[model samples]
Target chain A: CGSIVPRREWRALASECRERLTRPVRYVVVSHTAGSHCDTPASCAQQAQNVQSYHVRNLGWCDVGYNFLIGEDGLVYEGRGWNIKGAHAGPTWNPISIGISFMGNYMNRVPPPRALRAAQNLLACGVALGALRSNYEVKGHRDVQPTLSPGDRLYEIIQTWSHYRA
Target chain B: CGSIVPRREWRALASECRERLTRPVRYVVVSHTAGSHCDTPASCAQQAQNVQSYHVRNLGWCDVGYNFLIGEDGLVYEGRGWNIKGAHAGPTWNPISIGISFMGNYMNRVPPPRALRAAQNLLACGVALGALRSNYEVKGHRDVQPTLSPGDRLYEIIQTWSHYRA
Candidate 1:
């Protein structure tokens, strides 16, 4: 809980949708920025802003996607968060899943131990908040869509998580 | 004798602006849809429409990004085509290369022999039409970028092409 920066910490666009998800969500979809990563507070916040701009201004999505974004700095950046249905995975997974995107490309490089720990801990935090089901299923972005997201190395590590599904 | 379907035949959406390419282009960039493949005219036409829509609507490219899009239907769907520069490869190769994208992903699975034949045939057609140099270089999209595209199997096959370059 201490590691997550609320939506205010790294500014988010004002939105009209503001939709909330049904309680105790069952699926957790994992993805990667497939772009740049940031380690410093200022840079990580800027990365969050950049992601939002692409998802919003470029992709014309409702908001910066993923329920939360995990920074290389070992902090969680709130996006649509636990309450809102996200647009990360395809339609089938979007409404029913909590999407978590790791910032930066990871096809070859492994995310730092601190970043991995932060992501796993955030999932635990979601369970405690009663927003995600205790039995939520973890899935790679590639599992749900046609992408090389969450990267090869990151994908391998997540497979060993207690909650990961095929 | 034209094996490739021209834009009019496939009902490609009107593209308002386009930049022409330098003739007898020296390079050919290959990629894949990373999506489902289509094997019939009805389905493949839809594939072309979907690509144009994604580029023109979602990604806001001028048109479908590839110079030509091949289908499992064993046909080449004209995109920006031979005369214009494509947007498939990054800035470095896009301008000087002819981009040819297969209509579906081929990472683990290989495209049909018919599809492969169609691609080779299309390349030969380009050379005969003076759109490509007689000794044009063939490159996988992954060869020039940090992305897995054109799929592993297809990339391997193309590597054996008489025109392929390392």
Candidate 2:
């Protein structure tokens, strides 16, 4: 057998993974660039990890803050065990929401075009897989929170959704 | 005289700047995100420059893409000479709009908390100065773009404007 899993094998794995997911997941893509610039991707990852660890360890939870994390390099990480409820989306909506965070200080900058494309692709997959509702209502964390979790640069980009769906 | 200009200086500047402005100059606080992983305040400045240069030299335009560019560091850069018709808003609405861009990408990230508050303060300034309309419509580039110029993360953040007066 080849060392790499075949596409079919991966598809099967994803299917099995999908079957095991518990909550009625509704994807809500959000911005995290509230304007504090960190140095590198590693720092970005650490920042996310710190937030994850704090929510799980200090906040007394089972895992991290979100269900998925996307980096500037367009890499996506698993957070809070995708099956569990995310601390984001507030307590009222957390049970049915899957929160995803991008790593960056957006108040000052725009996401690299590549990463942006990746995020759109990821959302497409989430919607296609039925993890997110067809009309799941994509939003930013600031929409529900008292604080601005995401930055203004990222917020401008997401508002472009009107063109995509139209 | 102090190195830093006072509010009166700003008022004087606004008065002088008004004459040079080509558009009607209505105040609409548009939000944005940088959408990248490795953006710093400096990088954000450079990115804003890139956008400005593109709008001016390449697009054969008179000024930059936005009236102001805010960073996650809470620093706002004067874009497109700071008092011109930004290409950011829709063509029909351009004459009566003031565009503000934040630095950094936010599609998959959360902005620094500090930057968000600063942006609000800046927005308040714009509102108080009548740069923004009484019933201002806060929006993102995607609100009028043909493509996904901003990203998902930032877009959700703009939705929070529902809680504000306009």
Candidate 3:
């Protein structure tokens, strides 16, 4: 991916989490915002904040739930970033996987091509940084949790990727 | 403060906070548990875990709210420790100060002399390790918050300390 946007650039709230994930995580879980989508830099950045606000203020979470968020503008907004464990999945997976959620609903609609590429680039970057194992497996949100998250269209797409299992 | 009982020794749950405080902080906030008192090593250690459990499981905090806890057993029990920003005070003081609390209610009574010495020793240790400034100022919790915490007798004792400030 292009230079990833640091939390400061995206104006992230200071996180309150103290738990760290063991580095070079073995799994990557893909999810969707299941909410509004943004294409322009300004709109996508606001969308990122919107997502974080819901997680923090509404859900009473320590910070944003995802490890990273992809915008249709082809940019990545850092969430907890690479080191901290995310709240995206349930207890079993939250500590074990890096969560990357696309900032939009994807039931029937697919994220723009640039957004998809940005996510792949992010995975490559994680590999390079040793934040994720090179052989890390990609997973859909619905696979592990009892929800229809990540939606049908996005779920179908992730299955075709080389790293997807099942 | 003798050797601090590390989180491992007291069976601490994993902390979920990522935020950290800059080293050599300039202020120290002294508080009291205002809960149960423990005089023996085992009882004090259990009290420490109870404090952490309430903060983490009930209040949904990242970890114990204090930087270090003084026990009637004349021992120091580590909380979030020196490096992490504690949640003892509101946002204003949390980031700038190191929080140290006594593990018992101090409204009508004073902690034993040994307990008081443990706290002072811990402050010296902080300065030696550069976690706190040599000239750090200590403020009773009531001084900054609108509550009668670190209560009557204990408050009087802390006021007599050399570093205590109005």
| TM-scores of chain A across candidates | 0.95, 0.70, 0.97
Error of 1 at A144 (Å): 60
Runs in model 2 deviating more than 4 A are A1-166, B1-39, B81-83, B162-166
Return the lDDT, model 1, position B145.
95
In candidate 1 the C-alpha lDDT for residue B140 amounts to 92
lDDT of 2: 0.52
DockQ values per model: 0.01, 0.02, 0.01
Worst 10 residues of 2 chain A by lDDT: A1-10
Q: Can you write out model 1's per-residue Cα lDDT over A1-166, one digit (the tens) per residue?
A: 4246667667778644466789899989999988798865457778998998898999888888888998875557888888888888988888889999999999989876556766876787677679888789999999999999989999999999999998
CA deviation > 4 Å runs, candidate 3: A1-166
Candidate scoring better on lDDT of 1 and 2: 1
Model 1 residue A86 distance off true place after TM-score fit, in angstroms: 64
Error of 2 at B154 (Å): 1.0
Candidate 1 runs further than 4 Å off: A1-166
**Candidate 3, after superposition: displacement of residue B96 in Å?**
0.2
Q: How many angstroms is residue A43 displaced in model 1 relative to the true structure, after the best TM-score fit? A: 58
N/CA/C clash count, model 1: 1
